[PDB]
């Protein structure tokens, strides 16, 4: 199937408390693999996945230097945006960026992306064509004009189609035992009473990877996505994920409801009952 390399970058100013906090977190698919945090003593790029032990010391030195340079670029951007938006220097503001590429099973590029946000709202983003930008407001339009004059899209496109894709292929090769594995979900149902003649049935799916999964509740063969309650799929601390979905049913009629679990590690979907 397809695979992705994504970097989540955050710069947060803190007036009166020194320099902004700067963080970079990288993921290959749903697995965290590298991280940089300016608030750590002796800030350096660090491995977050076991297979990254395969890179030499040169890799860490180069990524650390790049991170420090990027940190400084965002310090300047925070000041620049205060000007664009005519805001005071006493408040905290945030810049967020998501950067990355996706490749198919054959390793060829499927899509690239680079999106920025300021204080939690869209700022500017590279369009799917990897040639033009989409600006959310007049401040971002200033940035758009600067980037067009500097040829930023061409520079970024070269990174997305070249460097990004080539390194993603390498990470998938080196971490194959971890990244190309499939951990099948193990499920079970819990039961809880309610004040009125009804009960809550909760279906749990545990220990699976990758993260994509589908949990549904059925009645007479009809899906109850409309009356279903659930949580977003979440990490469980060891590289696997979990999720649950619940429905409220009449007491004494719990046997008519079934939970269905669909996942890459389930040749045939699971069907559970209380």
């Amino acid at each position: 199937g397809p695979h992705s390399l994504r970097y989540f970058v955050t710069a947060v100013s803190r007036p009166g408390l020194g320099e902004p906090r700067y963080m970079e977190v990288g993921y290959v698919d749903d697995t965290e693999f590298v991280r940089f945090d300016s608030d750590a003593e002796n800030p350096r790029y660090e491995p977050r996945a076991r297979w990254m032990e395969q890179e030499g010391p040169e890799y860490w030195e180069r990524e650390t230097q790049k991170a420090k340079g990027n940190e400084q670029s965002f310090r300047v951007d925070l000041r620049t945006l205060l000007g664009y938006y005519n805001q005071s220097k006493g408040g905290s503001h945030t810049i967020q960026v998501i950067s990355g590429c996706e490749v198919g099973s054959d390793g060829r590029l499927l899509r690239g992306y680079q999106q920025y946000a300021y204080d939690g709202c869209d700022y500017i983003a590279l369009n799917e064509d990897l040639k033009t930008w989409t600006a959310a407001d007049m401040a971002a339009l200033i940035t758009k004009h600067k980037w067009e004059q500097a040829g930023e899209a061409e520079r970024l496109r070269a990174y997305l189609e070249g460097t990004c894709v080539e390194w993603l292929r390498r990470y998938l090769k080196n971490g194959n035992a971890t990244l190309l594995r499939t951990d099948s979900p193990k499920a079970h149902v819990t039961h809880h009473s309610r004040p009125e003649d009804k009960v809550t049935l909760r279906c749990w799916a545990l220990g699976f990877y990758p993260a994509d999964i589908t949990l549904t509740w059925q009645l007479n063969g009809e899906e109850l996505i409309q009356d279903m309650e659930l949580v977003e799929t979440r990490p469980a601390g060891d590289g696997t994920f979990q999720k649950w979905a619940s429905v409220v049913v009449p007491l004494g009629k719990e046997q008519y409801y079934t939970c269905h679990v669909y996942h890459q590690g389930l040749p045939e979907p699971l069907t559970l009952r209380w």
Binding site: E24, N70, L81, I124, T163, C164
Partner: peptide, 9 residues
């Protein structure tokens, strides 16, 4: 691997 030498905002 991370990108670098980006154009400022």
């Amino acid at each position: 691997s991370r990108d670098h030498s980006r154009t400022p905002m």
